[PDB]
Design a protein around this ligand. Structure first.
Ligand SMILES: Nc1ccn([C@@H]2O[C@H](COP(=O)(O)OP(=O)(O)OP(=O)(O)O)[C@@H](O)[C@H]2O)c(=O)n1
Ligand SMILES: Nc1ccn([C@@H]2O[C@H](COP(=O)(O)O)[C@@H](O)[C@H]2O)c(=O)n1
Length: 306
């Protein structure tokens, strides 16, 4: 038995994207166990403006990412040894920003001098601001994203497991754009539908999403959406470019036991047909209620306050 390295992060985690998730993956790789501190609405307000998502929304999203072992709510804004000592955490991990006080001293001086501060690289291809811009475009399809996808980035995000005997294969599908607490609440309930679930998430092509969603959607592209969704602990695997209709070929290919959709509107397939007709014919379709009303369109409207 080796001695366990417990690891700390903190931040606002306000509108979580695959950069947040890649930093948490990276931080968790540095030890055995990741704890994450998230600040309150009130606390974020004192330093920046108030955040787009409420604390309990933010606590829940972070908790949903597979590298995170626990979420400490109302974490202080600035990391301290008092906090590290209090959660038995060997060291903290931040991305490499310039973090200086007004007089030129380091915000994390205490921690750095104690030898208890580690850095990870910033994730390429994304930031909340970049995303704010993508939303502004949509409200006022060839591709505004310059994320560079690789096999290695997918290897790092994927759990990498084939369905074992006894596991109940469950397929779901959609846009999964701006992967959010609504999708998490949906997937987390789907995950209750069996003892040992193996959830596969079909991700519609960008061209398809633009067609059925109008405008400049999707905000995120298939590759980005791939990682967003693989970061979720309830997901075992992803179809990267799934058809809109849940075909026979697909169900048979993945040996699907079960198919779900949430309480959102199902838009008819181009020929008028129910794209879930085939699993309903087999009697393996089941509708689920997430309990969330959150959609990509509501995230846009909450994120633009002018
Ligand atoms: N593409 C990005 C964006 C952010 N982060 C890291 O995530 C850390 C903690 O997250 P948090 O403070 O809660 O959010 P932001 O950093 O504001 O996210 P962003 O820059 O995208 O707005 C940040 O220091 C940031 O460097 C990262 O690694 N890669
Ligand atoms: N708030 C939400 C958002 C999505 N969902 C479900 O998540 C899946 C993917 O949704 P999108 O294709 O709309 O991203 C769908 O089955 C949808 O019904 C939900 O149950 N509650």
């Amino acid at each position: 038995g080796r001695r366990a390295v417990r690891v700390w992060c903190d931040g606002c985690y306000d509108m979580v994207h695959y950069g947040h998730s890649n930093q948490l993956r990276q931080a968790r790789a540095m030890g055995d166990y990741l704890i994450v501190g998230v600040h309150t609405d009130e606390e974020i307000a004192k330093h920046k403006g108030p955040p787009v998502f409420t604390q309990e929304e933010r606590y829940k999203m972070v908790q949903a990412i597979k590298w995170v072992d626990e979420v400490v709510p109302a974490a202080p804004y600035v990391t301290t040894l008092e906090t590290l000592d209090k959660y038995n955490c060997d060291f903290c991990v931040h991305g490499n920003d310039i973090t200086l006080t007004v007089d030129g001293r380091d915000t994390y001086e205490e921690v750095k001098q104690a030898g208890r501060y580690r850095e990870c690289k910033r994730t390429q291809g994304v930031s909340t601001t970049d995303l704010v811009g993508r939303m502004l475009l949509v409200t006022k399809w060839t591709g505004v994203s310059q994320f560079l996808q690789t096999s290695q980035k997918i290897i790092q995000f994927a759990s990498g497991k084939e369905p074992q005997p006894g596991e109940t294969v469950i397929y779901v599908a959609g846009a999964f754009d701006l992967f959010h607490i609504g999708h998490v609440d949906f997937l987390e309930k789907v995950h209750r539908l069996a003892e040992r679930p193996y959830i596969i998430a079909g991700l519609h092509f960008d061209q398809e999403v633009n067609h059925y969603k109008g405008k400049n959607y999707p905000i995120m592209n298939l590759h980005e959406r791939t990682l967003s969704v693989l970061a979720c602990r309830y997901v075992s695997e992803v179809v990267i470019g799934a058809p809109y209709a849940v075909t026979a070929e697909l169900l048979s290919h993945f040996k699907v036991d079960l198919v779900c959709h949430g309480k959102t509107e199902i838009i008819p397939d181009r020929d008028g047909s129910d794209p879930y007709q085939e699993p309903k014919r087999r009697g393996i379709f089941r509708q689920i209620d997430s309990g969330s009303n959150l959609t990509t369109d509501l995230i846009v409207q909450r994120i633009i306050t002018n």
